[PDB]
């Protein structure tokens, strides 16, 4: 079973988006009004699930083939790859990376999405994989289209892919969104802008990666992820 043997750098909650960011309208009623209560790290917070023994299907990481209903999905074929490291620069191997997204036209395969753009019969929209022994992951997918949404009267999410990363503990677990280099919708999005610091915003923007592309086949984007730095305990209870 799991052991308490490490500590994780405290989050900077001014680097992360705050809870109350009223331009993102749903945040108004879904943000606490009391301060968070700080607690010391114990075994409860410094351990978490490892997914080495989860059974992955052959195409779990490949959205071009994992919803195959007779053809390929329509849209810009892309590899999304990168490395998961902690804040000390240490690779985070064998960690679970999940992603989900709309199709090429900004339509989600979810019963609650009634956007008028059509679904793609060969695109599902979910992927998962474990980072390799060096902290690298990779998915193959279609670049998602912008998605309009009922926030302001004319609000549009930039092209984005949702990411969840487990890391070594429940303290490191993170959900975020990947955006694409140069997308002019990024500065306009109230969800992007829930992040106050533009340099923090920059950390969510995947870069075109021609070095990783398959010529005559698919382009590639690089998106690296940094989880809380992990260190050994020292001088505790003495």
């Amino acid at each position: 079973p799991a052991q308490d043997n490490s500590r994780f750098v405290i989050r900077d909650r001014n680097w992360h988006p705050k809870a109350l960011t009223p331009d993102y309208k749903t945040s108004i009623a879904r943000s606490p009004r009391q301060a968070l209560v700080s607690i010391p790290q114990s075994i409860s917070e410094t351990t978490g699930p490892n997914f080495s023994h989860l059974g992955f299907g052959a195409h779990d990481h490949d959205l071009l083939l994992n919803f195959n209903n007779g053809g390929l999905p329509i849209g810009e074929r892309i590899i999304v790859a990168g490395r998961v490291v902690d804040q000390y620069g240490k690779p985070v191997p064998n960690t679970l990376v999940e992603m989900w997204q709309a199709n090429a036209g900004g339509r989600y395969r979810h019963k609650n999405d009634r956007y008028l753009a059509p679904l793609d019969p060969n695109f599902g929209g979910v992927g998962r994989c474990l980072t390799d022994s060096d902290g690298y992951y990779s998915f193959r997918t279609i670049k998602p289209g912008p998605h309009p949404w009922r926030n302001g009267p004319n609000d549009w999410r930039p092209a984005h892919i949702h990411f969840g990363i487990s890391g070594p503990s429940i303290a490191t677990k993170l959900i975020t969104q990947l955006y694409f280099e140069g997308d002019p919708l990024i500065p306009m999005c109230p969800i992007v802008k829930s992040i106050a610091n533009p340099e923090a915003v920059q950390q969510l923007i995947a870069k075109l990666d021609m070095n990783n592309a398959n010529p005559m086949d698919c382009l590639a984007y690089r998106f690296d992820i940094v989880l809380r730095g992990q260190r050994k305990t020292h001088f505790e209870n003495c």
């Binding site: 009623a29 943000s31 409860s44 917070e45 299907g57 949702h162 975020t176």
Partner: protein, 200 residues
Amino acid sequence: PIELLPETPSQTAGPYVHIGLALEAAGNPTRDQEIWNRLAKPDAPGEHILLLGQVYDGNGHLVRDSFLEVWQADANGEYQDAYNLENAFNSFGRTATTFDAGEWTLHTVKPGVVNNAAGVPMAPHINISLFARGINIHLHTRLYFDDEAQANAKCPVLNLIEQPQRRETLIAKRCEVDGKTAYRFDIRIQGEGETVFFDF
């Protein structure tokens, strides 16, 4: 001062989180293996319980698109981190609120006691992380149990909450669902009876 690499900033899971993390609920087919809300095979050691709850926003309305991750010790107070659908018990699970009733459920065993880093026993608890549309960074909480009042009174984590009244927000109420032992743990994100949320 020493400045490390900055952590990747959080973003909301969004309303369609189910597509990625709760496939059935999104209306989609599931893969051969899914990480979900049954932590214990019927065989597993310990007292088998059902957990259930609803999640409320600042206006007292149901948050029908919440997504929850849980982490708890087994009945012997051990964290089972090697996740495997063949395990008698998994310390980790996921659940989500139904869109109609806004209720999540989790099938588990009551966790045994573990000590904090100073060696002081904590009361039996389930660690919870709450994700949803409108939640920019997930909210951490703990579910404790109302039939563990002696332990809860001594918990070195509950005692970090300055006001006794706020400690009550974390105590799940033992009840019965279809005749089986259960605990209800409602979460109030904002306003009266606001659930204590943690930073660590």
